Amino acid sequence: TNVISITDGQIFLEAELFYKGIRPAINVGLSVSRVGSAAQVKALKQVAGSLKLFLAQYREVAAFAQFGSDLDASTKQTLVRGERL
Amino acid sequence: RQTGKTAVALDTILNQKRWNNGSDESKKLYCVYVAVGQKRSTVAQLVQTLEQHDAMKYSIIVAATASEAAPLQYLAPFTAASIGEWFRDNGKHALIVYDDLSKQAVAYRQLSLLLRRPPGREAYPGDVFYLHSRLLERAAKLSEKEGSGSLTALPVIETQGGDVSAYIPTNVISITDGQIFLEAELFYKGIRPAINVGLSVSRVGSAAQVKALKQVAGSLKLFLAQYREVAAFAQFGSDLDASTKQTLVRGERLTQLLKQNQYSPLATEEQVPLIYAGVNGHLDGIELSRIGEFESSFLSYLKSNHNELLTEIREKGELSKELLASLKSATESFVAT
Amino acid sequence: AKSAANKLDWAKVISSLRITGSTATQLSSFKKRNDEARRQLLELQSQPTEVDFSHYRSVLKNTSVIDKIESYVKQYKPVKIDASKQLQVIESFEKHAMTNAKETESLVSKELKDLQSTLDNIQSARPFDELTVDDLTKIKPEIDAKVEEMVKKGKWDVPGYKDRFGNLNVM
Amino acid sequence: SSGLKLQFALPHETLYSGSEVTQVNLPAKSGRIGVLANHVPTVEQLLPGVVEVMEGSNSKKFFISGGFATVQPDSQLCVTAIEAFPLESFSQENIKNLLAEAKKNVSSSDAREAAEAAIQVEVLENLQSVLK
Amino acid sequence: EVEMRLKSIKNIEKITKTMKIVASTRLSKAEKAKISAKKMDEAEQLFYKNAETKNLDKELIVAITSDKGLCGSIHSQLAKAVRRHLNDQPNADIVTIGDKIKMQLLRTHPNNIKLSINGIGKDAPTFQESALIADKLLSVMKAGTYPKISIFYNDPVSSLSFEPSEKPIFNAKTIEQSPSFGKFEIDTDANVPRDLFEYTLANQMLTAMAQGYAAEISARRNAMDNASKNAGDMINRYSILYNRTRQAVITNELVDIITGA
Amino acid sequence: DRIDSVSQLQNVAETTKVLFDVSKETVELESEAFELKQKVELAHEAKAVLDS
């Protein structure tokens, strides 16, 4: 807890995503760099704005795993976007 | 934390206005709350709520601030014990409600682990049970040899995460004779009271129960236990028949009903009425959500229309079969208008 | 005895099968109940319309206004008056309601008598076998005219003249 | 609707669904059903023959071993056959000569079995006949 | 005992995943069959629409269930309709199809089940197997003489929006003399009515069995799916409890060791 | 059935106007509670001044 709070951030690279084979497997929801914008590169931010929403939507919509046929088609495209990202 | 079990205590105290505020010693239960380790602002809130509803006329609230020192908090429950002795020992039936006693335990922890005494189980001081008993065991109901007075106690313990399974919680639940468990979900799920009816229990249901709630509504008490068991199985099972579904709907309306709103103590007048009407199909036919006002209307109808029968149920001490029939007539009237 | 006052309306709703659909009578019942509710609320929640000058002023040793406050309180014994201005509106409403209800009740009694007599002229006064056929045009004044009218223009058929009867072949 | 629609959807795999055609001539139970266009309201159980479904394009010939072709008033020929057949896979020599004769061994069974297999006795001849 | 609970739930989850794979394997075939079967039945339905083929009026009782023993509401809903038919028409003969429907039909009326054939839901709905089942039905006890027969068959709308819905069958008498059968003509020599009755039974049965196998494969992907969700939730809860218990045990160990020191 | 349509009106003429009056005059009696609320509010105001 002290390591997290003292740091100006918490890129909590949980093991689970690493266990899916991923070498650099950060967690999408957990990482929140407070002063990142002041160090962000604008061109990247231009695209990462949509990346953040895609990740949040993938997390929000992967709940309906066993009811995906009836899921909204736009939600299916959002899931496709989350998977691709 | 912030479960308002303190508020459950406060409402319990406020009932020392429908009997104590009269003149009846036999009805007198001179409550004495406690304040063991609470933010002094909460103390002010308690004092104001006592004065406005006119409770401070019957409640001595010994105080121990969080800003106050540890020995003060530790000795406070002993002070409440002393006050309880001074009252009950005189021969009048009195009551007590210790405040959050978890703070008292933390104070005993400070007193032991800070002076020189080696710590015990759960890192807390070894004699936690000793202190807790010496508090609770003071309360009793002496015989006519000692004046037939009593000092009924409602010690309040606190956990983390609603933990029933803890050293202080479980050890105390061995000491106290009754338990009323307040959850976290229900505390945000469905009830301002949010008292886990199934989890809650008291070691004396028959002996010393509201003669209205047992002498006539003893079947209603067994129905309370039965409907609680019924709602226990109401999670994901299918619809085997209609009997289970009917029990579920009626008991759920009953549960949405039974929560006595905060600082609104008004009881020994139509207690049985909820279960009796549910089994007799008076309220159960109403919509579940609408009961939130239907109960109020039924109570007011009993008050201004069934005034003789309702007042008798208050005073006669039992809801007789004849009074049951008159209440059935009043129930028909409530269903009608 | 406020039970009886709404008892009549509760009984009426119990028998309002002919009175169901009251568009502006349930609103009046709501107004009457709201008046009683506010009256009970004023009686219960509000303390006495008085001053606890027996001791409370003494608790204020140098109030220097408890005398003035009690003076205003006693001099404000009648803040205002009641308004029982219903003295001709009540009479006119009563007249309209009573005349209409009396007309309704007399009409209902007359309907009861007419139904009873017609049934007495039905339970044994429907000679379905030996009544003269053309006497139907006597009992039904338009039967003769329409029957002459029906065949007169040229059409010899009517819409389902035998809907419940048979036409039959030779056998 | 102009033309004539066919619904050739057998219990194995549906072939045609309301497609337009100029002829669907087929071997009915009482005869040869040469319904070209529109046809009339009459549906017939069919006999093993050739259904040269003449679409707007050429008439594909497939020796079909049974069905019923419902000539719905909408020039719809609901040919719910029991078997499917190509214009090329339904055409062969050795497969249509030895299989029936080997099946004639089954005809050596008891009376009801022979009564059943009497259909198979001439079943394979139809395909080799309509293969052209 | 929490560890055994977590591991047993994990094993049940693995078994559920295996059942899901088996469900996919069977559902591929069931859908493949139902695709053509629906069109096959629509072909003769076009005639039943071409001629209003209402059947009026020894009447069989039927249900739809494949060779599996219930999945959520696959067998239960059909069993309820079977019990309703048994109450309404106790003298109605039962056609026991597959296993679960066979067992449910044997339950109500012993004198109703006229056949007991098992393992119909072995795979996709096959034309020849369904046709032979019908031909045996068309030969067993004069089921053609059965004036009416209602197919209490699954109607899977998209995933599971179904029950054993009841429909009529146009029989030998009800095909020739239908009121709008004057539209489509028949031949005295061709003996159309009997053949139309038999083939209508065939198309209805094949389409209904294919739809029911697809719907129960759905019950193997829409009832075990709920069971998979329950296993996921229980596994998350148990994993939380065990991870908390291990951490708390280590912490209490450190506290005890230091408190000793 | 005509008799039945007349049957409901039988025991309704007894108290239709009685209800018309009971729900009218008792509701008319609310000016007393209004003026009493006025005096009680004046008492609350002055009592609060005294409490201040």
PDB file of C-alpha atoms in Angstrom, chain B residues 155-297:
ATOM      1  CA  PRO B 155     -24.834  -4.947  24.966  1.00  0.00           C
ATOM      2  CA  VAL B 156     -23.793  -3.796  21.513  1.00  0.00           C
ATOM      3  CA  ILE B 157     -20.671  -5.218  19.908  1.00  0.00           C
ATOM      4  CA  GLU B 158     -19.148  -4.210  16.584  1.00  0.00           C
ATOM      5  CA  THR B 159     -17.167  -6.214  14.040  1.00  0.00           C
ATOM      6  CA  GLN B 160     -15.320  -5.531  10.800  1.00  0.00           C
ATOM      7  CA  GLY B 161     -17.170  -6.630   7.683  1.00  0.00           C
ATOM      8  CA  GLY B 162     -20.141  -7.760   9.760  1.00  0.00           C
ATOM      9  CA  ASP B 163     -17.925 -10.577  11.037  1.00  0.00           C
ATOM     10  CA  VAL B 164     -19.978 -12.899  13.200  1.00  0.00           C
ATOM     11  CA  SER B 165     -16.870 -15.113  13.445  1.00  0.00           C
ATOM     12  CA  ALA B 166     -14.462 -13.146  15.635  1.00  0.00           C
ATOM     13  CA  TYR B 167     -12.842 -13.481  19.050  1.00  0.00           C
ATOM     14  CA  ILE B 168     -14.767 -10.657  20.717  1.00  0.00           C
ATOM     15  CA  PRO B 169     -17.970 -11.258  18.695  1.00  0.00           C
ATOM     16  CA  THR B 170     -18.201 -15.024  19.130  1.00  0.00           C
ATOM     17  CA  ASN B 171     -16.992 -14.920  22.734  1.00  0.00           C
ATOM     18  CA  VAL B 172     -19.603 -12.314  23.620  1.00  0.00           C
ATOM     19  CA  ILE B 173     -22.335 -14.194  21.752  1.00  0.00           C
ATOM     20  CA  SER B 174     -21.585 -16.947  24.214  1.00  0.00           C
ATOM     21  CA  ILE B 175     -22.079 -14.494  27.080  1.00  0.00           C
ATOM     22  CA  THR B 176     -25.173 -12.597  25.917  1.00  0.00           C
ATOM     23  CA  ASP B 177     -28.429 -14.540  25.745  1.00  0.00           C
ATOM     24  CA  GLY B 178     -29.753 -12.935  22.568  1.00  0.00           C
ATOM     25  CA  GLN B 179     -28.380 -11.958  19.209  1.00  0.00           C
ATOM     26  CA  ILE B 180     -29.633  -9.624  16.498  1.00  0.00           C
ATOM     27  CA  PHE B 181     -27.294  -9.663  13.511  1.00  0.00           C
ATOM     28  CA  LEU B 182     -27.122  -6.589  11.272  1.00  0.00           C
ATOM     29  CA  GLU B 183     -25.616  -7.289   7.859  1.00  0.00           C
ATOM     30  CA  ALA B 184     -23.850  -5.183   5.251  1.00  0.00           C
ATOM     31  CA  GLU B 185     -25.921  -6.052   2.181  1.00  0.00           C
ATOM     32  CA  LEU B 186     -29.319  -5.649   3.837  1.00  0.00           C
ATOM     33  CA  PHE B 187     -27.936  -2.492   5.441  1.00  0.00           C
ATOM     34  CA  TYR B 188     -27.895  -1.242   1.866  1.00  0.00           C
ATOM     35  CA  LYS B 189     -30.200  -3.840   0.246  1.00  0.00           C
ATOM     36  CA  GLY B 190     -33.735  -3.706   1.510  1.00  0.00           C
ATOM     37  CA  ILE B 191     -34.499  -2.441   5.007  1.00  0.00           C
ATOM     38  CA  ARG B 192     -33.732   0.571   7.165  1.00  0.00           C
ATOM     39  CA  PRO B 193     -33.716  -1.951  10.045  1.00  0.00           C
ATOM     40  CA  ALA B 194     -31.853  -4.614   8.012  1.00  0.00           C
ATOM     41  CA  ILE B 195     -31.976  -7.034  10.930  1.00  0.00           C
ATOM     42  CA  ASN B 196     -31.189 -10.562   9.745  1.00  0.00           C
ATOM     43  CA  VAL B 197     -34.326 -12.242  11.065  1.00  0.00           C
ATOM     44  CA  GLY B 198     -32.988 -15.748  10.544  1.00  0.00           C
ATOM     45  CA  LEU B 199     -29.582 -14.936  12.006  1.00  0.00           C
ATOM     46  CA  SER B 200     -31.053 -13.033  14.952  1.00  0.00           C
ATOM     47  CA  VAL B 201     -32.124 -15.128  17.938  1.00  0.00           C
ATOM     48  CA  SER B 202     -32.853 -14.822  21.643  1.00  0.00           C
ATOM     49  CA  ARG B 203     -32.553 -17.620  24.193  1.00  0.00           C
ATOM     50  CA  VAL B 204     -36.071 -16.895  25.558  1.00  0.00           C
ATOM     51  CA  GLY B 205     -38.857 -16.799  22.978  1.00  0.00           C
ATOM     52  CA  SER B 206     -41.698 -18.361  24.939  1.00  0.00           C
ATOM     53  CA  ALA B 207     -41.066 -17.207  28.489  1.00  0.00           C
ATOM     54  CA  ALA B 208     -40.940 -13.407  28.532  1.00  0.00           C
ATOM     55  CA  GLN B 209     -42.504 -12.524  25.200  1.00  0.00           C
ATOM     56  CA  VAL B 210     -45.193  -9.956  24.468  1.00  0.00           C
ATOM     57  CA  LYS B 211     -48.307 -11.782  25.649  1.00  0.00           C
ATOM     58  CA  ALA B 212     -49.995 -10.245  22.624  1.00  0.00           C
ATOM     59  CA  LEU B 213     -47.306 -11.735  20.403  1.00  0.00           C
ATOM     60  CA  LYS B 214     -47.420 -15.226  21.972  1.00  0.00           C
ATOM     61  CA  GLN B 215     -50.557 -15.901  24.046  1.00  0.00           C
ATOM     62  CA  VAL B 216     -52.619 -15.325  20.900  1.00  0.00           C
ATOM     63  CA  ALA B 217     -49.946 -14.980  18.204  1.00  0.00           C
ATOM     64  CA  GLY B 218     -47.733 -17.853  19.329  1.00  0.00           C
ATOM     65  CA  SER B 219     -48.765 -19.501  16.092  1.00  0.00           C
ATOM     66  CA  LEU B 220     -47.664 -16.201  14.559  1.00  0.00           C
ATOM     67  CA  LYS B 221     -44.237 -16.637  16.165  1.00  0.00           C
ATOM     68  CA  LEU B 222     -43.949 -20.169  14.784  1.00  0.00           C
ATOM     69  CA  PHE B 223     -45.098 -18.681  11.468  1.00  0.00           C
ATOM     70  CA  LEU B 224     -42.337 -16.095  11.729  1.00  0.00           C
ATOM     71  CA  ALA B 225     -39.788 -18.879  12.163  1.00  0.00           C
ATOM     72  CA  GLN B 226     -41.414 -20.880   9.359  1.00  0.00           C
ATOM     73  CA  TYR B 227     -41.525 -17.958   6.916  1.00  0.00           C
ATOM     74  CA  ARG B 228     -37.919 -17.080   7.727  1.00  0.00           C
ATOM     75  CA  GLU B 229     -36.967 -20.668   6.908  1.00  0.00           C
ATOM     76  CA  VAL B 230     -39.128 -20.298   3.790  1.00  0.00           C
ATOM     77  CA  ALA B 231     -37.311 -17.186   2.595  1.00  0.00           C
ATOM     78  CA  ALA B 232     -34.061 -19.012   3.397  1.00  0.00           C
ATOM     79  CA  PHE B 233     -34.596 -21.315   0.394  1.00  0.00           C
ATOM     80  CA  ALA B 234     -35.813 -18.508  -1.905  1.00  0.00           C
ATOM     81  CA  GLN B 235     -32.630 -17.878  -3.921  1.00  0.00           C
ATOM     82  CA  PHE B 236     -32.460 -19.979  -7.101  1.00  0.00           C
ATOM     83  CA  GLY B 237     -34.790 -22.956  -6.674  1.00  0.00           C
ATOM     84  CA  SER B 238     -37.476 -23.452  -9.297  1.00  0.00           C
ATOM     85  CA  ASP B 239     -41.244 -23.279  -8.749  1.00  0.00           C
ATOM     86  CA  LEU B 240     -41.976 -26.801  -7.532  1.00  0.00           C
ATOM     87  CA  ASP B 241     -45.571 -25.911  -6.632  1.00  0.00           C
ATOM     88  CA  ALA B 242     -47.792 -22.987  -5.721  1.00  0.00           C
ATOM     89  CA  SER B 243     -47.515 -23.463  -1.941  1.00  0.00           C
ATOM     90  CA  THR B 244     -43.866 -22.390  -1.847  1.00  0.00           C
ATOM     91  CA  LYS B 245     -44.508 -19.422  -4.152  1.00  0.00           C
ATOM     92  CA  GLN B 246     -47.453 -18.233  -2.056  1.00  0.00           C
ATOM     93  CA  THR B 247     -45.413 -18.522   1.132  1.00  0.00           C
ATOM     94  CA  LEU B 248     -42.619 -16.567  -0.556  1.00  0.00           C
ATOM     95  CA  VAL B 249     -44.841 -13.713  -1.749  1.00  0.00           C
ATOM     96  CA  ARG B 250     -46.715 -13.374   1.557  1.00  0.00           C
ATOM     97  CA  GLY B 251     -43.571 -13.555   3.695  1.00  0.00           C
ATOM     98  CA  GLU B 252     -41.780 -11.069   1.446  1.00  0.00           C
ATOM     99  CA  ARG B 253     -44.661  -8.618   1.819  1.00  0.00           C
ATOM    100  CA  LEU B 254     -44.395  -9.255   5.559  1.00  0.00           C
ATOM    101  CA  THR B 255     -40.658  -8.502   5.557  1.00  0.00           C
ATOM    102  CA  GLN B 256     -41.173  -5.318   3.548  1.00  0.00           C
ATOM    103  CA  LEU B 257     -43.756  -4.481   6.209  1.00  0.00           C
ATOM    104  CA  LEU B 258     -42.047  -5.374   9.469  1.00  0.00           C
ATOM    105  CA  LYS B 259     -39.312  -2.723   9.407  1.00  0.00           C
ATOM    106  CA  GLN B 260     -40.413  -0.298  12.139  1.00  0.00           C
ATOM    107  CA  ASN B 261     -39.263   3.072  10.847  1.00  0.00           C
ATOM    108  CA  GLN B 262     -36.502   4.888  12.689  1.00  0.00           C
ATOM    109  CA  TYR B 263     -37.456   6.692  15.907  1.00  0.00           C
ATOM    110  CA  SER B 264     -41.029   5.464  15.395  1.00  0.00           C
ATOM    111  CA  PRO B 265     -41.653   3.128  18.332  1.00  0.00           C
ATOM    112  CA  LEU B 266     -45.301   2.038  18.297  1.00  0.00           C
ATOM    113  CA  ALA B 267     -45.861  -1.659  18.934  1.00  0.00           C
ATOM    114  CA  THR B 268     -48.085  -3.448  21.450  1.00  0.00           C
ATOM    115  CA  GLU B 269     -51.222  -2.576  19.481  1.00  0.00           C
ATOM    116  CA  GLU B 270     -51.203  -4.457  16.139  1.00  0.00           C
ATOM    117  CA  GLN B 271     -48.093  -6.620  16.300  1.00  0.00           C
ATOM    118  CA  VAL B 272     -49.706  -9.947  15.333  1.00  0.00           C
ATOM    119  CA  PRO B 273     -51.773  -8.120  12.710  1.00  0.00           C
ATOM    120  CA  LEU B 274     -49.210  -8.481   9.933  1.00  0.00           C
ATOM    121  CA  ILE B 275     -48.835 -12.277  10.084  1.00  0.00           C
ATOM    122  CA  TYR B 276     -52.504 -12.818  10.949  1.00  0.00           C
ATOM    123  CA  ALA B 277     -53.611 -10.796   7.914  1.00  0.00           C
ATOM    124  CA  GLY B 278     -51.046 -12.528   5.717  1.00  0.00           C
ATOM    125  CA  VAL B 279     -52.334 -15.975   6.648  1.00  0.00           C
ATOM    126  CA  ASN B 280     -55.907 -14.635   6.638  1.00  0.00           C
ATOM    127  CA  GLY B 281     -55.183 -12.904   3.329  1.00  0.00           C
ATOM    128  CA  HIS B 282     -55.843  -9.259   4.179  1.00  0.00           C
ATOM    129  CA  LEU B 283     -52.555  -7.460   3.486  1.00  0.00           C
ATOM    130  CA  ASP B 284     -51.123 -10.180   1.224  1.00  0.00           C
ATOM    131  CA  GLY B 285     -53.713  -9.230  -1.389  1.00  0.00           C
ATOM    132  CA  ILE B 286     -52.304  -5.700  -1.442  1.00  0.00           C
ATOM    133  CA  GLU B 287     -49.332  -4.855  -3.623  1.00  0.00           C
ATOM    134  CA  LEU B 288     -45.988  -5.360  -1.907  1.00  0.00           C
ATOM    135  CA  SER B 289     -44.714  -1.842  -2.600  1.00  0.00           C
ATOM    136  CA  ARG B 290     -48.036  -0.243  -1.638  1.00  0.00           C
ATOM    137  CA  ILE B 291     -47.842  -1.819   1.828  1.00  0.00           C
ATOM    138  CA  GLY B 292     -45.486   1.012   2.773  1.00  0.00           C
ATOM    139  CA  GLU B 293     -48.595   3.191   3.040  1.00  0.00           C
ATOM    140  CA  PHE B 294     -51.234   0.462   3.395  1.00  0.00           C
ATOM    141  CA  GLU B 295     -49.855  -0.436   6.812  1.00  0.00           C
ATOM    142  CA  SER B 296     -50.046   3.197   7.900  1.00  0.00           C
ATOM    143  CA  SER B 297     -53.646   3.437   6.733  1.00  0.00           C
TER     144      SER B 297
END
